[PDB]
Every structure is written in C-alpha cells, then in structure tokens.
Amino acid sequence: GRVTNQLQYLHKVVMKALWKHQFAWPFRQPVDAVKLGLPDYHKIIKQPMDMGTIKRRLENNYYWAASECMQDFNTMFTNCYIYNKPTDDIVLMAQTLEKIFLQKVASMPQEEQELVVTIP
C-alpha cells in the first residue's frame, strides 16, 4: 500500500482515540469463536475484522486509500450489530465507538495525498 495524509490521520488520530477507549477491549483482537464456544460466528460473519488487525495493517502500510481503512472499521462495527442481540451492551459499546469514529473522521484532511516527496 502507501502512506497518505488521510491514512496517517486514521492511524495517528482516529485509531489512537479508539484503541485507548474504555470500550475498545472486545475489538482489539479477532473474535476467537473456538474459545468462546460460538460455532455459528463464522457461519454468520463472513468477513471478520478487528482493531488489532486494522492497526497492524496501518503499521505495515497495507492500505492504498483511507476509504479501504474506513471500510475495515465499518465492517468491524457492522459484524457486531449483525451477530449480537439488539439489547446487548456490546452493541451500545460499538455504537459509542462508531460515533467517535464518525466525529473524528469528520475532521480528516479533505484531499487524499500520498505523503511522499520525490527527487524527479
């Protein structure tokens, strides 16, 4: 992938805020459905995603565009809403983190530019 102003913002502003949040801990690592005794998790959730995975991807410049990274964040939250019961606290935890995600995303740089300065 590459490094852009928007990806750097997702890494150093958005991920920094979410990763340290009180509610982050269910989302800092992939779901281990074997240890949790949930054999239906991977039948229902076809694209697992978590903040540990996103953070590693950002660290390794996996993304080409901030929108791909935002889609991983979105997939993470959506998986939560799809699999769990509407009244579960983890749903309100996801909704809390997602609102911060959106509020932080609103102040992201407008024009995506690769953070690169090259000798022609």
> What contacts 62, CB < 8 A, 6 or more positions away?
1, 56
Smallest gap from residue 111 Cβ to ligand R78 (A): 34
CB 75 within 8 A of CB 49: yes
The SS3 call for residue 17 is helix
Nearest partner of 74 among 53, 45, 50, judged by Cα: 50
Segment near ligand R78 (CB under 6 A); pick from 9-17, 34-42, 54-62, 105-113 = 34-42
64 binds ligand R78 (CB under 6 A): no
By the rule CB under 6 A, 41 interacts with ligand R78: yes
Please identify, among the stretches 35-43, 52-60, 99-107, 109-117, the one whose residues bind ligand R78 according to the rule CB under 6 A: 35-43
96 binds ligand R78 (CB under 6 A): no
Measured CA to CA, the distance from residue 7 to residue 5 in angstroms comes to 6
DSSP 111: S
Minimum CB separation of residue 55 from ligand R78 in Å reads: 15
> Applying CB under 6 A, does 83 fall inside the site for ligand R78?
yes
| Interaction site with ligand R78 (CB under 6 A) | 26-27, 31, 36, 38, 41, 80, 83-84, 88, 90
